[PDB]
Amino acid sequence: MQIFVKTLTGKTITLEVEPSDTIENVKAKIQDKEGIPPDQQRLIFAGKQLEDGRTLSDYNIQKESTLHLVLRLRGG
Ligand SMILES: [Zn+2]
Ligand SMILES: [Zn+2]
């Protein structure tokens, strides 16, 4: 099962996920691929910012769904 994650630069990465993966889990897969710490990541789906403890299934995120990755300003 695959989802796409688009960054502000237009670049897209593909993650292998499961319906019961938490948002925490997705951030960890993004850290593995891109080396960005989870606390710097905000994930958005359907215009809504996803919360760490909820699952992809909670949010009706399906195969081939696209999430948007917004980075926190390092140092705020
Ligand atoms: Zn998983
Ligand atoms: Zn398809």
Instruction: Give the ligand with the smallest distance to the CA of 26.
Output: 1
Q: Which domain holds residue 15?
A: 1-76
CATH of residue 31's domain is 3.10.20.90
CA of 63 to the centre of ligand 2 (A): 7
Q: Residue 35 in 3-state DSSP? A: coil
DSSP, res 29: H
Q: How many domains does the chain have?
A: 1
Beta strand ranges found along 1-76 (DSSP E): 2-7, 12-16, 41-45, 48-49, 66-71
CA of 17 to the centre of ligand 1 (A): 5
Q: How was this structure determined?
A: X-ray
Entry resolution (Å): 2.0
CA 15/CA 29 separation, integer angstroms: 7
CA of 6 to the centre of ligand 1 (A): 19
